[PDB]
From a paper:
We therefore pursued a site-specific 'disulphide enzyme-substrate cross-linking' strategy, which enabled us to obtain four structures of JMJD5(Q275C).Mn.NOG.RPS6(A138C), JMJD5(N308C).Mn.NOG.RCCD1, JMJD5(N308C).Mn. OG.RCCD1 and JMJD5(W414C).Mn.NOG.RCCD1 as cross-linked complexes (Complexes 2–5, respectively). Compared to Complex 1, single sidechain conformations for the target arginine residues corresponding to 'productive' (A in Complex 1) and 'non-productive' (B in Complex 1) orientations were observed in Complexes 3/4 and 2/5, respectively. In the substrate complexes, the β3–β4 loop folds to enclose the target arginine region and active site.
JMJD5 is a JmjC domain-containing protein, present in both the nucleus and the cytoplasm. Building from an extensive peptide-based screen for potential JMJD5 substrates, our results provide evidence that JMJD5 is a JmjC-hydroxylase, catalysing the stereoselective C-3 hydroxylation of arginyl residues in sequences from proteins involved in chromatin stability (RCCD1) and translation (RPS6). Consistent with previous reports, JMJD5 residues 174–416 fold into mixed helical and β-strand topology comprising seven α-helices, 13 β-strands and 3 310 helices.
Numbering used by the authors:
A (entry chain A): 182 to 416
B (entry chain B): 139 to 143
The structure:
Amino acid sequence: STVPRLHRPSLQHFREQFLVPGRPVILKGVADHWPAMQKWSLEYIQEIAGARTVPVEVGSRYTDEEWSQTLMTVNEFISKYIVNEPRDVGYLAQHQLFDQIPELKQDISIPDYCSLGDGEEEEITICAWFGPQGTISPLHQDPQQNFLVQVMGRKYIRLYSPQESGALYPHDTHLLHNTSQVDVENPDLEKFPKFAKAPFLSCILSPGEILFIPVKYWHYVRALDLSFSVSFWWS
Amino acid sequence: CARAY
Ligand SMILES: O=C(O)CCC(=O)C(=O)O
Ligand SMILES: [Mn+2]
């Protein structure tokens, strides 16, 4: 089924119906007035961030054997992996761009819902996810609550509850134990038969929308267009 | 925020 969409729910409603039970939801009317929503174009990103060095993941999926990480300027990333017919998929993923470039922080806001957590605002981790159509983050789970805010483009997102972990065949190794062995959109059902019947939620996340990903909820993400998302990891 | 370590 689909992830529910709610317009600006009260803190108490979000707490009781979503945060405490650990249920995903899309929040509307919360981030649609970030300055980023109108300001962030490729040209703006080049002007504010183009000369800075960022880590770039190169390859279809971080679970691939050919996949690698490199360093380049934001201008180089845009030129090589977005605008010119790219030779490979590149992704500026999982990067604390707003600590690197404080000016961009003025264009976003931490959702007020984060104040319901038991952690300090100073410990909230804010990451940028910027890349072309077709980037894929394989199915994985994270150790904190997350608000994933879509600024540019759309993403297809599949969510599996922690209760379904046995059907998702987590990797055995330490570096990948938070990651599924299954390719969500083309699963090997001969090797991973339990995956076929595992229930899930899905959505297309569009600009101005926030997806709440409960702590430890398994999530898979594919960009459908040139995309920029901002995540807030909080407890 | 990493998933790739
Ligand atoms: O947008 C993506 O590719 C992945 C986002 C993610 O895994 C996160 O925000 O924790
Ligand atoms: Mn994640």
